Design a protein around this ligand. Structure first.
Ligand code: CL
Ligand code: CL
Ligand code: CL
Ligand code: CL
Ligand code: CL
Ligand code: CL
Ligand code: CL
Ligand code: CL
Length: 209
């Protein structure tokens, strides 16, 4: 029964993210895991490690290796408010820009993620850039419950072995996949591959989209 701790060691995490903002810590991440008990705990260890690498690689890509807590371009913040929604944009028109490890964006996603976590992030979206425990939960929420532009959750893509490619599709596939941005598809694949090497697992199939 022995050691069933997290498949990413603190030291591997540091190697993966040498230039992280202080907001993002190993502890913060390991604390969030219990909110998504199947994450990195489903299937063989080859698979758990694969899933951990897949998540953190995509996280790396969103944030510049966890340097950025929030989206940089203030001028474009207003666009993340989808006025066509009925609960509107109560925290402000300009309040729903990218924050945290998956750069959670859009009033509708702040709403969905908050409902899921039991936290009213529609009203207090600033929590994702102020409270690490919440930021990390928003990352796991996306990874474990959202299809995005694709057809399956990133979790299931790896767990059912449909390919790291489906994680990309489900994160930003309408713009990047199907020829849209092969360079950036490959960048994500590059970081995933390095991360699988750090953890001593394999990449598995269908890396691309
Ligand atoms: Cl740390
Ligand atoms: Cl879960
Ligand atoms: Cl990266
Ligand atoms: Cl406003
Ligand atoms: Cl916290
Ligand atoms: Cl919390
Ligand atoms: Cl693009
Ligand atoms: Cl690269």
């Amino acid at each position: 029964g022995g050691n069933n701790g997290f498949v990413v060691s603190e030291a591997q995490f540091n190697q993966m993210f040498p230039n992280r903002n202080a907001f993002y810590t190993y502890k913060g991440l390991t604390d969030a895991l219990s909110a998504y008990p199947a994450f990195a705990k489903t299937g063989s260890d080859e698979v758990k490690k694969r899933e951990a690498a897949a998540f953190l690689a995509n996280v790396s890509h969103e944030t510049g290796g966890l340097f950025y807590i929030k989206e940089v371009n203030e001028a474009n913040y207003p666009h993340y408010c989808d006025t066509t929604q009925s609960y509107g944009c109560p925290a402000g028109q300009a309040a729903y820009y990218g924050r945290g490890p998956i750069q959670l964006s859009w009033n509708f996603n702040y709403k969905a993620a908050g409902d899921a976590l039991g936290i009213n992030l529609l009203a207090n979206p600033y929590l994702v850039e102020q409270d690490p425990a919440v930021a990390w939960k928003t990352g796991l929420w996306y990874w474990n419950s959202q299809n995005g532009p694709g057809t399956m959750t990133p979790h299931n893509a790896i767990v059912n072995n449909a390919g790291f490619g489906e994680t990309i599709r489900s994160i930003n596939g309408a713009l990047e996949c199907n020829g849209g941005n092969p360079a950036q598809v490959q960048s994500r694949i590059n970081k995933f591959t390095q991360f699988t090497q750090i953890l001593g697992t394999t990449t598995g199939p269908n890396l691309s989209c």
